[PDB]
């Protein structure tokens, strides 16, 4: 049993018609204090995989060297280590959430949620989530923390069900994203204008995208706002 | 204190109420008697909290003796049990409550009926053919639904209240030093001073 | 739960109800109380379910592997201990059983031994185990005799699962009836207490306090 | 929350963000800390909303009840019925207040009132969560008898860092000029802060 | 609970959810949480359900009297102030979470307040449970210059956000639109979208399916003539 | 301890065609004791039938209150109090005692005499008013009759018909619940006949 | 403090046929007041033609289902491919659940399929292993609203044959398969009305001689 | 100071009348005149608007006055008595009924109620 | 469980040992042996929490069995009270020690003396002519103080012990259904029948 | 306590203050915080000087060993044996280190661990109680590829300001000075940076 120190907040990802998208603020809370703004919370497997962690960030740091490890130890002795046998989302997911249930159960869990984002080798959409707990669940749209609470409402209008998802492109799936982090941002106390994101599409690969901000923000009409009442 | 009974037969109610007062680690007394006469026709047996309970019964005694001067004339037993649910549950929400729980065995000469009220410290009334307060319900409810007769008579009353004292006496772990039996009927109270 | 066992002339009478709770819920009234081990071994459950179920079917096995090894039946005294002692280890840990172990060996005749979670093992002639053990021991006490028939004492066992059935709260459902001899136990059927309770009070003349 | 209070050379500017947080949720991102107790009388509110919100009423009302007998009353004596109540009811009251006042015989004045309901008369006052991070900064910086635009850009820069390491500080940096001219609001986006 | 207040042009629309729940159980399918402090004063609560009607109905009761005694339509301020000196006496044990809403001779207002007793002021405010449900939709969708028609369709899709993605919000959406130099519309159960679909079978059973032990005729009438 | 759960009970009111019907069982306990099977918890004022669940000192109490306040409204009104104007009087009464609460889950159940109208409404302890179509439901067995009452009723069932429909819902909840039972009233009630009805239930 | 244990709702349903078994449950997992997956299946079939559904803490519940579906397999390799009896997969959940009695599996667990002799069979679990076979189960969160109607509805419990008046019982007449499927959606449909924890979807696992059959039904996603 | 008269100003005289109500009524007598008449499908009730000053706006002053929804009340006697006792028939009918039964009083038991107030002015001290 | 007495008289030690079993509210069993021969002229009685106590009085009973086997030979009632006392000053800074509280009444063969030795379940061990564990001390002490001799016979020893259980049965609360007697003598040990 | 390092274009430099108090008393008012791990690897410690004086003994054994088979390592080695003592007991542990070197290849680095054992490499670091105060000045203060003499002003009106506001900060000014030309140790007294 610990407490989070240096935390991350909401990681927010849907799925599309030809992939995943996911994304997550570059910001490490030191409780109230907005500490370090410089931390990629989006880490990369190969190239078809993200793994978007919230929570403790030395907890981070440390799956972030597990997935390191597992990549090296995936090429010993494996002439198709870039090829058929390959690191998979669905294979990285599971030794995380393998870890994550093992680590609660002898009571001293990796304080984080993680939602594993990727495209399998028969070019399917994985998205699942893993949590402290060891409780995995997936989903058309997926987000931790306040994410969960403000990004799913918006990113569920856009992919209510699974056979919204042929019907959802890209830019659409992208537009949600980005208006859900704006959101994040007026309303999360603990979020930061600056994030991360990556698509993970069946044809163009991995496309991850770094100093993105939050634009387009309404701030005018707070000029009109007097008193608190009278 | 710790074990009252009460039975409602025929023609009478009976009371049994346990003579040994406990305090702390030693028995002080093993001639108590747990009751109160409210009127000719009523007697009130009581249990709880040290203090409490006679004093209570004292105050509930005085108030139905002040009503009767008053009206030259005796409340009904339901009226009497009326009165006293109503001063518990008024007390359960007092500072400090009364922790008394009460059996009112009444005779109604207008009725020519004997009734039986159990009451607890909440305010918590029902009319009986046979009750009791604390642990006693446990051991002796199961002999009184197994051998209860409406009918019965008041000496077949008072044998079937020697089962109780015997499954009691065999199964409690506390020794209550014998009960002080009493019959309210048409004719008023008496005391069995053998039992 | 409610469970009971007494000897007499005729020889062992086990009497348990069919209630199992979980707060005020009523979780089942099919759950089976009473556990044949073998041929002249009954074991009883009270307390948690999970832990008898658990351990008085290992007892079972423990058993078997005693007259495997020692070519002869165990004796109730063997086989309660072998549970006691069991419990004994895991005392603190949080075991909640209280059971009765009947058997009938030709060196020890009719015999049960209370056995308990705390580790407390009793040699008795009546036993009353469970929430409504206190019902059940007041007409057992009041009709109890040596000399019953089994055809009377099952009845006062059924009767006294009736009498804990109505007024404890957490017991009910319906009345396993085992009657254990010479030569074994000899199952004497389900009898539901919705049915039961009307059918006692009609002939018996008792529960006069209900309106039926 | 991060509010602050600064004098200067024409008479004292009000410095507050506009976010209120419920937990780590921002219930509102547009909130007003600067509250009229009197025309040239104001006061930064931090700690318990509904205490805060409470107390200021009060006071307008005891101001407004005493202006109709006395006229015109001093900063001084608005301090000391915000004290009067904050000092009297500090077991039940979470309230950090600054107030702010403007006379044409004092000129600017700045009393602060933290937890305990004690009173601080001072050049300039900073106070909220946010103000924690800005000790080091307002004191190299401030300096007395600043002009109004140096006194505006001092607050905006305070605030802007305040308002950048706090979680609890955020929106938009709403300031209040008390002069001999009268009473002007300014307010700063953002956009335009987050670049200094 | 999941009720929003938007501004409008010309006025002020509140919304809400019509589910009550004790603990995980609804026990209310249809509860209308929109009550009215005066004609043209409206206000939604969220909390404790007792406590967010009771102080309604004491502070339309007084406003009605106050209305009576000065000659004058009544404040949405006059309701405001007398709401949160209430609550905060009460110290947040009074738990009425509400969004205050009308139009008066002054204008059109929207006002939030909680049991504490701290108010706020907004051009769309969002309460309860499904409040971040609802906020998320309010912040992705208003702008300045609604009109009556977006201002509805904005507010009832804060309440859906609330129904579908909340658990302690769902059924029908209630509104309440208040427009300047106009009667208060009060449109209870604006959407239907959890309507029941139709079971598989029939539990109407055959008559004498119970046992009965005793019948009585009960005599609800007075005591009798004659 | 739980003031709600000591004595144990449950009462149910339904709606039906021009009838409403409301239910309780018979039980008060000490906890797991059975102590009486003869408590009524439907009482009722003129035409208005109050069901009320929970601690049974504060259900006697109540009862005590509403028909003392009921004979003072028909002396000064010269008329039986309505089942919406009552539903509103405890209310009021509940939340008076906000902060020192009875610890009770009453049941209103009757017809408007004069617009004829079924009328049936539910309270929380603090007097938080539930005025539903179709069923309330109160007290230890509430899950398991909210479970039977909304897979079992049907809208506009004839008195005779609503008799069972109620009967079985509460029959089958108080069996599944350790603290009721022990015996079932229903009341059909019509615009001017009532008929009451004792319940044949298993005494476990 | 780490609390270990979580509650992820859901509601499930095991009823045993004359020839054929079912187990139903929601598709709704949750945590407090958020939906966390609309469709997240929640019945497994398990091989040997054994449905499995562990109901409560989702993590327990995948683990146990997981080791369970592990058991089957060793059972396979130790004793020749023989195919492991419904009686006997019950007795070998009571070991992996009381193996955990002192940190238990937080989940109400149901199995359903067929005995030796061919006849529907529900095996009913308690979360430290206590077991026993029954014609009628619902376990999870609206566990409390669904078995009572089932005790009515199943068994005719309280139910009896009009004209003589609670003298004689409703006789319990045998249910086919589509009988047993318009009670568990009549079940999931009044849990979803009451309970805010049930709704989303409906998946049954049908079991017979022939093998293990899945449906499929949309609830209400309020 | 306190309010030292806590007994009686009406007082029964030798031949059995109420003086000070007496002296009420001949005020009222003095007062303009008032009426009420009832209709089968309504209630009309009038009075003289006697303004003391013709540079006095007599719509400010109402004689006529709404005490519930479904209830109106006129006058005749002195003016300021009148607006008093408005003001607490208004209340009484929230306090002592609205607030208990959720719907305003008949008019019958809102008149008990003024009645009650002016009796209770005829005997308090 | 309850309670448990031991004196030493001139030729012999008398155990006496409630017979009470209770578990909760109810009294399981009246006839209940609290003691063990450790060996022909050594037994012990025992009172402390269930299970622990029967478990304790077998362990010492098999392991001073074992050491008559092997030896051939029968240890003195003070070295079996000192090997006991040793277990339970081992058992008070055991993971779960024993809750145990003992008397051991032996007869010495070599030295033709009786000998009574109390030992707590802390390993507190003390030679005595009378001794008691639990509230049983508080009543008998005073009694034992003041009829205690050193040379009274064994019949004097027992009405001494019968006056005692008397005052136990008169002022403590439990009813403990009275007491199994025991005496070590050089003849070893036998059970008074009737008491 | 206060400590930071600033890393400028001749290398790193680290400043720490010389209090060390138990409870509100100054158990030592001249304590050395700034302490070697290697010749031009140092680091600043702060919270348990119990906990951060057993760490940063293991650290300078663990790179003496590595040194004796591996050659000189890198600052980022340091910080990695640092986080791996810090991460893996974060229960028994509290500490907040800042690791400050000098490579020739690297140039200066530095890398700050706080509480929970994560790691964070960053052109300038703060630390300890008095920190919060300065992050506001420090902010706005702080340019990459300082000179020396700016550095050290840098460091000295920061911690001066940071020394002011915090009681548990103060004494005197230590810093160390990690460059290709060696290892300088500097100390200001409070006459010195009071007055600044
Ligand atoms: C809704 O279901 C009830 C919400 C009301 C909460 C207040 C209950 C007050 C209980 C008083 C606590 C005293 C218990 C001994
Ligand atoms: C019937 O009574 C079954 C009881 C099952 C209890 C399950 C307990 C689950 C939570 C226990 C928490 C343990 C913490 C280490
Ligand atoms: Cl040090
Ligand atoms: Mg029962
Ligand atoms: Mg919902
Ligand atoms: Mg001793
Ligand atoms: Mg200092």
């Known amino acids: 049993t610990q407490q989070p120190i240096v935390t991350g907040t909401s990681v927010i990802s849907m799925k599309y018609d030809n992939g995943v998208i996911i994304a997550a603020d570059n910001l490490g809370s030191y409780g109230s204090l907005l500490r370090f703004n410089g931390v990629e919370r989006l880490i990369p497997v190969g190239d078809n995989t993200v793994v978007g962690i919230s929570g403790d960030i030395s907890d981070m740091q440390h799956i972030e060297r597990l997935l390191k490890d597992l990549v090296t130890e995936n090429a010993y002795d494996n002439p198709l280590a870039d090829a058929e046998e390959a690191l998979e989302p669905s294979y990285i997911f599971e030794y995380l959430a393998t870890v994550m249930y093992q680590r609660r159960s002898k009571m001293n869990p990796l304080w984080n949620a993680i939602i594993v984002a990727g495209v399998q080798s028969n070019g399917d959409q994985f998205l699942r989530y893993v949590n402290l707990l060891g409780v995995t669940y997936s989903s058309p749209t997926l987000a931790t923390g306040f994410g969960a609470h403000m990004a799913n409402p918006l990113l569920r209008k856009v992919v209510d069900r699974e056979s919204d998802i042929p019907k959802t492109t890209v830019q659409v799936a992208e537009e949600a994203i980005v208006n859900a982090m704006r959101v994040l941002y007026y309303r999360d106390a603990r979020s930061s204008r600056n994030f991360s994101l990556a698509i993970i599409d069946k044809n163009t690969g991995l496309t991850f995208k770094k100093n993105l901000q939050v634009e387009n923000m309404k701030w005018d009409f707070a000029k009109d706002i007097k008193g608190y009442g009278t | ?195 | 739960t409610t469970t009971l066992a007494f000897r007499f002339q005729g020889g062992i009478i086990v009497a348990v109800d069919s209630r199992a709770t979980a707060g005020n819920w009523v979780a089942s009234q099919t759950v089976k109380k009473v556990i044949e081990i073998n041929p002249f071994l009954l074991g009883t459950m009270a307390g948690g379910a999970a832990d008898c179920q658990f351990w008085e079917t290992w007892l079972g096995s423990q058993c078997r592997l005693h007259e495997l090894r020692e070519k002869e039946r165990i004796s109730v005294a063997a086989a309660s201990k072998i549970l006691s002692n069991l419990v004994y280890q895991y005392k603190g840990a949080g075991l909640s059983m209280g059971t009765m172990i009947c058997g009938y060996t030709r060196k020890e005749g009719p015999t049960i031994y209370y056995v308990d979670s705390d580790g407390t093992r009793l040699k008795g002639d009546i036993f009353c185990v469970g929430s409504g053990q206190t019902f059940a021991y007041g007409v057992l006490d009041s009709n109890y005799k040596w000399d019953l028939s089994v055809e009377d004492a099952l009845y006062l066992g059924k009767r006294s699962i009736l009498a804990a059935a109505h007024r404890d709260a957490y017991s009910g459902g319906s009345v396993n009836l085992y009657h254990v001899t010479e030569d074994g136990w000899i199952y004497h059927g389900n009898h539901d207490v919705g049915e039961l309770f009307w059918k006692v009070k009609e002939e018996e003349g008792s529960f006069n306090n209900v309106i039926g | 929350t991060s509010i602050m209070a600064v004098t200067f050379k024409d008479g004292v500017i009000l410095g507050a963000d506009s976010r209120t947080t419920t937990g780590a949720y921002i219930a509102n991102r547009v909130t007003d800390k600067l509250t009229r107790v009197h025309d040239k009388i104001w006061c930064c509110r931090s700690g318990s909303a509904a205490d805060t919100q409470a107390i200021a009423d009060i006071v307008q009302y005891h101001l407004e009840l005493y202006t109709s007998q006395y006229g015109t009353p001093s900063t001084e004596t608005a301090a000391s019925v915000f004290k009067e109540l904050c000092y009297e009811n500090k077991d039940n009251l979470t309230a950090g207040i600054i107030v702010a006042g403007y006379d044409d015989k004092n000129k600017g004045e700045v009393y602060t009132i933290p937890l305990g309901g004690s009173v601080h008369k001072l050049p300039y006052a900073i106070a909220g969560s946010g103000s924690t991070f800005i000790y080091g900064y307002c004191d190299k910086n401030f300096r007395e008898n600043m002009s109004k635009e140096e006194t505006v850009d001092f607050i905006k820069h305070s605030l802007s860092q305040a308002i950048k390491w706090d979680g609890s500080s955020g929106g938009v940096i709403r300031m209040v000029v008390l002069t001999a001219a009268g009473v002007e609001r300014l307010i700063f986006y953002p956009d335009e802060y987050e670049q200094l | 609970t999941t009720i929003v207040g938007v501004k409008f042009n010309n006025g002020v629309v509140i919304a809400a959810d019509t589910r009550s729940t004790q603990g995980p159980i609804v026990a209310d399918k249809n509860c209308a949480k929109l009550h009215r402090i005066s004609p043209k004063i409206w206000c939604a609560g969220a909390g404790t359900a007792a406590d967010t009607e009771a102080v309604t109905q004491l502070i339309g009761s007084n406003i009605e009297l106050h209305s009576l005694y000065t000659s004058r339509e009544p404040r949405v301020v006059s309701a405001l102030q007398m709401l949160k000196q209430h609550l905060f006496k009460y110290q947040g044990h009074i738990g009425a979470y509400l969004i205050v809403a009308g139009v008066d001779p002054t204008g059109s207002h929207l006002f939030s307040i909680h049991a504490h007793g701290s108010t706020d002021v907004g051009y769309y405010l969002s309460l309860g449970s499904g409040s971040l449900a609802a906020m998320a939709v309010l912040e992705s969708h208003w702008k300045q210059d609604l009109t009556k028609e977006e201002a509805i369709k904005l507010a009832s899709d804060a309440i859906q956000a609330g129904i579908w993605n909340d658990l302690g919000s769902g059924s029908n959406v209630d509104v309440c639109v208040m427009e300047i130099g106009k009667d208060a519309e009060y449109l209870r159960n604006y959407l239907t979208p959890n309507v029941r679909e139709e079971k598989q079978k029939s539990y109407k059973f055959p008559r004498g399916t119970t046992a009965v032990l005793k019948e009585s005729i009960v005599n609800i009438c007075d005591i009798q003539e004659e | 301890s739980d003031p709600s759960s000591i004595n144990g009970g449950i009462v149910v009111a339904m709606t039906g065609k021009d009838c409403v019907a409301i239910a309780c069982d018979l039980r008060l306990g000490s906890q797991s004791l059975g102590v009486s099977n003869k408590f009524e918890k439907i009482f009722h004022y003129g035409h208005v039938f109050l069901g009320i669940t929970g601690l049974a000192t504060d259900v006697t109490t109540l009862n005590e209150m509403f028909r003392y306040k009921t004979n003072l409204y028909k002396l000064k009104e010269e008329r039986a109090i309505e089942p919406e104007t009552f539903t509103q009087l405890v209310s009021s009464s509940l939340y008076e005692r906000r902060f020192g609460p009875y610890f009770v889950g009453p049941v209103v159940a009757g017809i408007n005499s004069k617009s004829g109208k079924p009328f049936i409404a539910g309270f929380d302890l603090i007097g938080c008013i539930d005025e539903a179509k179709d069923f309330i439901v109160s007290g230890t067995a509430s899950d398991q009759l909210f479970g039977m009452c909304e897979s079992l009723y049907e809208p506009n069932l004839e008195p005779e018909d609503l008799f069972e429909t109620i009967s079985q819902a509460l029959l089958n909840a108080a069996d599944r619940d350790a603290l009721s039972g022990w015996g079932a009233v229903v009341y059909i009630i019509k615009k001017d006949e009532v008929v009451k009805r004792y319940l044949k239930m298993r005494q476990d | 403090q780490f609390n270990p244990y979580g509650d992820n709702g859901g509601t499930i349903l095991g009823i045993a046929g004359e020839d054929f078994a079912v187990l139903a449950g929601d598709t709704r997992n949750i945590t407090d007041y958020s939906i966390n997956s609309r469709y997240e299946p929640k019945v497994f079939d398990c091989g040997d033609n054994i449905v499995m559904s562990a109901n409560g803490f989702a993590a327990d519940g995948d683990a146990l289902v997981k080791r369970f579906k592990n058991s089957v397999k060793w059972y396979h390799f130790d004793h020749n491919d023989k195919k492991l009896s419904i009686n006997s997969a019950a007795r070998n959940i009571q070991h992996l659940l009381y193996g955990k009695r002192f940190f238990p599996y937080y989940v109400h667990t149901i199995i359903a399929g067929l005995d030796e002799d061919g006849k529907g069979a529900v095996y009913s679990f308690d979360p430290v292993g206590s077991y026993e076979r029954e014609q009628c189960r619902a376990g999870g969160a609206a566990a409390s609203l669904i078995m009572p109607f089932l005790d009515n509805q199943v068994n005719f419990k309280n139910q009896y044959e009009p004209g003589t008046n609670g003298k004689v019982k409703k006789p319990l007449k045998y249910l086919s398969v589509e009988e047993v499927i318009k009670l568990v959606r009549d079940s999931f449909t009044s849990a979803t009305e009451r309970h805010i924890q049930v709704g989303d979807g409906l998946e049954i696992l049908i079991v017979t001689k022939d093998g293990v059959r899945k449906e499929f039904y949309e609830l209400k996603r309020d | 100071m306190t309010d030292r008269y806590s007994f009686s100003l009406t007082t029964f005289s030798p031949s059995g009348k109420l003086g000070q109500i007496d002296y009420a009524l001949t005020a009222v007598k003095q007062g303009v005149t008032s009426l009420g008449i009832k209709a089968t499908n309504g209630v009309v009730i009038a009075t003289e608007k006697k303004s003391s000053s013709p540079l006095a706006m007599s719509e400010t002053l109402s004689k006529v006055s709404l005490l519930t929804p479904d209830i109106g009340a006129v006058y005749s006697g002195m003016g300021p008595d009148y607006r008093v006792l408005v003001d607490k028939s208004r209340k009484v009918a929230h306090t002592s009924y609205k607030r208990i039964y959720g719907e305003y009083p008949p008019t019958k038991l809102l008149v008990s109620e003024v009645a009650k107030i002016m009796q209770e002015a005829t005997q308090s001290g």
């Open chain 2, 1 to 195: 204190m710790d074990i009252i009974l009460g039975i409602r037969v025929q023609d009478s109610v009976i009371l049994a109420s346990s003579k040994a007062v406990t305090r702390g680690i030693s028995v002080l007394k093993d001639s108590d008697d747990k009751t109160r006469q409210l009127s000719p026709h009523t007697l009130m047996s009581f249990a709880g909290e040290a203090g409490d309970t006679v004093q209570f019964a004292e105050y509930i005694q005085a108030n139905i003796q002040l009503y009767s001067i008053r009206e030259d004339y005796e409340l009904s037993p339901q009226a009497v049990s009326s009165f006293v649910r109503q001063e518990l549950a008024k007390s359960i929400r007092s500072r400090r409550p009364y922790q008394v729980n009460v059996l009112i065995g009444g005779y109604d000469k207008k009725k020519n009926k004997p009734e039986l009220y159990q009451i607890d410290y909440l305010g918590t009334k029902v009319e009986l053919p046979y009750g009791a307060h604390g642990y006693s319900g446990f051991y002796t409810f199961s002999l009184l639904d197994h051998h209860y007769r409406p009918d019965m008579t008041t000496e077949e009353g008072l044998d079937l209240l020697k089962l109780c004292v015997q499954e009691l006496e065999k199964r409690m772990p506390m020794d209550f030093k014998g009960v002080i039996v009493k019959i309210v009927d048409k004719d008023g109270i008496r005391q069995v001073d053998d039992f």
